[PDB]
């Protein structure tokens, strides 16, 4: 899926997920967008479930942009292992969302076609998203 | 310096020294 080609390091801290989103909250390319109103983190297989939902409800044209990109590796110790022997291996990759961030953009369609298309992509994402327009 | 070794006694030799060694004291172009 979406992940970097080569990385300067292999593992990374956890950190926190604070603040709002002041850059990333403005629609730039499309004319409609699905911005996110609750904080969370998306695990890069949800993105391909939500992408392949929008691309078959259009069928005709339109252009799709994917604004967010996962770059944060997240580990997971295997089962039946006591704690404290190192750090587990990287299983998947995560992007970090915070309220206001725009997830998908669309243009070249009707608004009422697109409004019922982001309904399909929102049922695959674990966040409370909304519908916004270009100003 | 003095390390440069001279042929300039013969670089300052005869210029129009016939067409017998230089093969031309009449033209510069070979044709």
């Amino acid at each position: 899926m979406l992940q970097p080609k080569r990385t300067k390091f292999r593992k990374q801290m956890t950190g926190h997920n604070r603040g709002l989103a002041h850059r990333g909250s403005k629609v730039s390319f499309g004319e409609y967008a699905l911005k996110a109103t609750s904080r969370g983190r998306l695990t890069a297989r949800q993105i391909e479930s939500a992408r392949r939902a929008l691309t078959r409800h259009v069928k005709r044209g339109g252009k799709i942009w994917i604004r967010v990109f996962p770059d944060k590796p997240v580990t997971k110790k295997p089962l039946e292992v006591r704690m404290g022997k190192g750090k587990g291996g990287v299983e998947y990759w995560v992007a970090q969302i915070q309220p206001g961030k725009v997830l998908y953009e669309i243009e070249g369609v009707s608004e009422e076609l697109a409004r019922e298309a982001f309904a399909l992509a929102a049922a695959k994402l674990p966040l409370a998203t909304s519908f916004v327009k270009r100003t | 310096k003095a390390d440069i070794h001279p042929t300039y006694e013969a670089i300052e030799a005869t210029c129009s020294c016939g067409n017998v060694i230089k093969t031309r004291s009449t033209l510069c172009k070979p044709i």
Binding site: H22, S25, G61, P99, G100, E107, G108 | -
Partner: protein, 188 residues
């Protein structure tokens, strides 16, 4: 296009948040060429009508500060990112002679029937909008009409092609660049 204001002699973080929940107001400033910057309260119920309007961004608005009247153009909107609503306004006095700078909407007026669309299986992809302006404040550009009905499947449109009327310059040609505007391409 008309608004009316008040003075706002209370500055901070604490006094600025109590405006938004208690009274429903919105802070603002008026800063211009001739005078000092002056702060101002407006309502969130009024600016909502102006921001809903189409060409109101590139247009002159008369402001009633007290009974004080001034022709005011708007160049900023700080906006709440999470919920989405207007936060402080930051607009500008208009002098009769100092050049000006604002942003102008585009329309792409005639693209129903394009030769790239009707002859070849066509698409029209608007890359840019909100192109700037550098005018004289006396005569305003509300918008700019662009016509992509004409020539081709497979041509892009630059900034040099579309024309700014009555002697108005474009800042992007004042710098050494020329941005592409719209494309016509084949669908997937």
């Amino acid at each position: 296009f008309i608004v009316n204001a008040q003075v706002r002699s209370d500055l901070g973080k604490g006094a600025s948040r109590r405006l938004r929940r208690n009274a429903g107001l919105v802070p603002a400033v008026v800063y211009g060429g001739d005078k000092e910057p002056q702060s101002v309260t407006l309502e969130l119920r009024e600016i909502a009508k102006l921001l809903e309007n189409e060409a109101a961004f590139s247009h002159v608005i008369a402001l009633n500060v007290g009974g004080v009247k001034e022709t005011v153009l708007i160049k900023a909107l700080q906006r709440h990112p999470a919920k989405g609503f207007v936060m402080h306004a930051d607009f500008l006095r208009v002098v009769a002679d100092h050049k000006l700078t604002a942003h102008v909407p585009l329309h792409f007026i005639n693209e129903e029937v394009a030769v790239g669309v009707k002859q070849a299986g066509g698409e029209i992809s608007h890359t840019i909008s909100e192109v700037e302006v550098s005018c004289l404040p006396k005569d305003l550009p509300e918008f700019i009409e662009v016509d992509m009905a004409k020539v081709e499947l497979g041509q892009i449109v630059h900034l040099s092609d579309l024309k700014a009327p009555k002697g108005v310059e474009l800042v992007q040609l004042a710098h050494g660049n020329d941005l592409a505007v719209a494309n016509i391409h084949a669908s997937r």
